[PDB]
Amino acid sequence: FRLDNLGPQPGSRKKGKRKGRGHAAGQGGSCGFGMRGQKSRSGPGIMRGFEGGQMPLYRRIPKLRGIAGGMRAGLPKYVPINLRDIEVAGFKEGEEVSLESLKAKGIINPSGRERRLPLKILGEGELSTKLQIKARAFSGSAKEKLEAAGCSVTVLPGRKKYIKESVRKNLARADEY
Amino acid sequence: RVKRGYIARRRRKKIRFFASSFRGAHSRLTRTIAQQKIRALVSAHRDRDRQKRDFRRLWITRINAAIRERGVYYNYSKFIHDLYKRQLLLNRKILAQIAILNPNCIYMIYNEIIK
Amino acid sequence: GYKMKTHKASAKRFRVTGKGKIVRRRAGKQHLLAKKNTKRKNRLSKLIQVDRSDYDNVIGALPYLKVNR
RNA sequence: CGGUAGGGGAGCGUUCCGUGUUAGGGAGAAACGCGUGCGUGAGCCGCGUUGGACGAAGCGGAAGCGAGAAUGUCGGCUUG
RNA sequence: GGCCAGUGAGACGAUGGGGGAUAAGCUUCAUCGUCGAGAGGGAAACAGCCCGGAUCACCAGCUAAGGCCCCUAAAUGACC
RNA sequence: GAGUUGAAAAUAAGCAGAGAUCCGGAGAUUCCCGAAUAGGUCAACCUUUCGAACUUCUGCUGAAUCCAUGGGCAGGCAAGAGACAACCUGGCGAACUGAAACAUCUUAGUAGCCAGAGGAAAAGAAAGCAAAAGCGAUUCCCGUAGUAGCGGCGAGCGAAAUGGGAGCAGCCUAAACCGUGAAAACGGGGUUGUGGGAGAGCAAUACAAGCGUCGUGCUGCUAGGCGAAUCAGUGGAGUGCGGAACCCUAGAUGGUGAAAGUCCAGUAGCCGAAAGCAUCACUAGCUUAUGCUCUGACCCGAGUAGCAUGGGGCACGUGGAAUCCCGUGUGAAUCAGCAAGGACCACCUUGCAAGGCUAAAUACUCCUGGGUGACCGAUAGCGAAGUAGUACCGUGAGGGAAGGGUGAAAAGAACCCCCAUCGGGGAGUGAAAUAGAACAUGAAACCGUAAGCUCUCAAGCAGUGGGAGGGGGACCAGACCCUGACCGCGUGCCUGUUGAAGAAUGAGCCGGCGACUCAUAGGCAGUGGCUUGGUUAAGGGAACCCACCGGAGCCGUAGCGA
Predict the structure, then answer these.
(1) The organism sits in which domain of life (chain C)?
(2) Quick one: three-class SS letters along B51-64?
(3) With a CB-CB cutoff of 8 Å, which residues 61-100 of chain A face chain C?
(4) B43 — phi, psi (to 5°)?
(5) Less CB within 10 Å around the terminal CB: N or C of chain B?
(6) How far apart are alpha carbons A48 and A31 in whole angstroms?
(7) Do C9 and A58 touch (CB under 8 A)?
(8) Cβ contact B29:B37 at 8 Å
(9) How far apart are CA A70 and CA A67, in angstroms?
């Protein structure tokens, strides 16, 4: 390939249409904006969502519930991982399953929250190959799948909350068998 | 990135050269040179369709005036009566041309339309 | 540079549902409820799709929420 | 296979840039003016007892990119 | 359905009506035709009436509406 | 190292191969006005006892008043005043606008005005974030993120924490205690945080580092120096073209009659500073200084924090309203404490306010020195390519133009004629005089002159179709161009209306300038690159772009519910 003979494929770069350059070009005269109104005048024009003096679409509808109250919205607290992410993976019979394994394998790519939401293994899909999972807690159906596969299942306690000594005393008093 | 040009003067000089013999400011003055180019071309349109129509009219009245020289009441309509009954497919009113370029031959035309 | 701002007065009213369609809460519920019917008060208690006109109006007025069509 | 508001497809031109210290050019380039030529047309090509040093095409890109209108505007020159 | 426009001042003519004074090229509706956005021919001229839907050329022919004394193409045609 | 007394020629005299002109470092003068400063002033002047006036510092004398204060006198190379485009800080601080009105809000703590100050300024060394895991001053960039929120929950406004980079630097002071003095001070000590310091007692000596007129050191800058390699023919001129050779550590650039590696100035490279400035490295020298045990007493910044109110600002508009700073008024505790962790209480965690100072990353151009430009080419680019903020206008604030290009070299026309000049024609220069000083290419409107055809019984958006008659060159002589007897037909163009030849709008004409553009995002379409999912931002880079890093983040992988 020389510097001469290079050319783009057709359809790759259309020409930008220029407006007000002749009526044979297509958008001459009023440049494709009719005759008058706010659509033809120059400026910000119309707010998108404005109904022309009518009370708008969004104001006539009541607010969504926790967003109406200002309550903090529903937020994912784990990484949802099915067993379909585990069978299609190249994990063989002897292999650990943890955070850095699923990151370094190419299943999860967590960036915005590396610190808060650990992991969770869910139920849909099967898992025939046995493994040794030391990750965070499970669903009941995924516990039925993993204990149905005969694999080493280990839940990992992540963090310990601070309990006040009178609350820890009142809870330790409740050990009445 | 200034873009002063010359293409309006060739664009305009072609239209300037077409507008010769327009008698005054229709042949010199640009802002009328344009609309005389325009009106001259549509004049060419309607005078072309009506030169078809107009030469049709001219040959009709010319062969009518040729046939009416017999004196006896033989019109132009009767020449077409006995011009299509005696099977002469479509002489196309060019007998109005050889009616003056060959008047004895159009006398042979009409004198064989009679028989 | 200048990021587009999410319109908050419609972000509190509209919502995406996984497949990618705008849903909304029906109107006429927090006012004069004895006057209505229980049939009306559970007809007006559910969240429905918004119709295509105002499904294509506010789709450009609320840019960062991943709605197809 | 008429077409206004309007929508889509395909192209011409301009100045600069890559090829480019390109081909060509004081044995006359650009300009300006010319055509019994070619195109659907925007335009191309050719000719000049004018002018005197630059600058094509092709394949590509980027625009202060195309004028007849704005009681537009700036110079020149009319009318009365 | 996706992207993406305009338009939201209409006008006359026939029918169905209301307002009027069954007055207006008046006003408002309902179905339709034209103009808008439609050239050509007939209408003397003349958006909306009739024929009619213009890709282009021909110094081609046949027709619709309408006409055949002259201006101006075609019958000073025939018979009541 | 060879000619000079600016542009800028001429004339008169000089100055100069015991080194001129010029360049560079350091000095000298600098009338008058202007901070303007001896006093006045109507700026560039007047009067003068010739004076840095005033404020500050120092010294003497020292009023009402004893000490004081004020004043006066004097000294002083004498510190400040004034100016500065933009950035920065502090204070006053809008309104048009957006909300399709408008008052809450926004525009906006922006513009403007004043003050100050530096090449940067502000901030800055945790009474901090965070959450039971951890970080370690401030600033800036990418990101989280247009998220959490705030808001007539309208218009809009919009963080922060985790993470990744640039740059890193920490130090002085008060109090408790000793000593001198009537306090007020001074000199030692101590300045820290899963606490220190003071008091009492025991040990113990030198490793390392910080600061710096002074001068030897280094490179760099402000003058410069050497510096490679060709002729000949061509229509004015050769650098272009054609023929013969060479340089390259040099083919960047500008000029030379014309375009240059070999003509010049230069460049690559090698060199070079008496003098000043700057860069880090020496130096006489000043400094920082150590560990343990006991001791809840003594201390750890008071009209301060907090509280009742009135508020401001943190994205947070008074809301549950925390943190931060102020107005009035009340008004604490010292470490067994106090403050913060978004009202508040209890526990834990974190830090030690009411005392100050600090470079870097960072923002900008009245500029300066280099290098560039899909930047302009005299209506452009700075308003300004000449007198440019000029002429001119305004009392003033202020507004504000226009005019470039003869040649290569003036070689700028000796002389003759017209003639009072201006001008013109010969001649002469030049390649060009139709390049003549109004001077380079010179288009259109506009004004003309010459040649061909044609108009004075004619109604016409000036055309067009047919074409009488006539004229011109011609070679495919039937063709082409010009004129137009007469006939048919034809309601200027745009805007904008239901409808415009319209007696609706617009334009005297000609030529230029003159309008969906740019930044960043969302969405969709078309073409790609990978699908072992994709892709980097900031930032680093042979000056920029760039190879290659840089996985922070983003998007898709799981949804439902408040």
Answers:
(1) Eukaryota
(2) HHHHHHHHHHHHHH
(3) 61-65, 67-68
(4) -60, -40
(5) N
(6) 22
(7) yes
(8) no
(9) 5
Resolution in A: 3.3
CB of B113 within 8 A of CB of B66? no
Q: Which domain does C13 fall in, by range?
A: 1-69
Which of helix, strand or coil describes residue A25? coil
Select from A96, A158, A86 the least CA-distant residue to A125: A86
Domain range for A99:
74-158
CA gap B84, B113 in Å, rounded: 10
Q: How far is CA B38 from CA A88, B21, B28, B30, in A?
A: 74, 15, 15, 13
Query: How many distinct structural domains can be found in chain C?
Result: 1
Q: What is d(CA A153, CA A145) in angstroms, rounded to the nearest whole number?
A: 11
A49:C61 CB<8 A: yes
Write the DSSP symbol of residue B96.
T
Chain length of chain B: 115
Rounded distance between C-alpha atoms, residue C64 and residue C69, angstroms? 14
Q: What single-letter DSSP state applies at residue C22?
A: E
**Could you tell me where the beta strands, DSSP code E, fall in A35-173?**
80-81, 96-97, 120-121, 132-133, 152-153
Burial of A175 (0-12, 13-18, 19+ CB in 10 A): exposed
Q: Which residues contact A83 (CB under 8 A, 6 or more apart)?
A: A121, A122, A123, A124, A125, A126, A127, A142, A145
Helix, coil or strand: residue A64: coil
DSSP-based three-state secondary structure for A53: coil
Using a CB-CB cut-off of 8 Å, the residues of chain A touching C14 are 58, 61, 64
Sign of CA dihedral A45, A49, A54, A59: negative
Rounded CA separation A115/A117 (Å) = 6
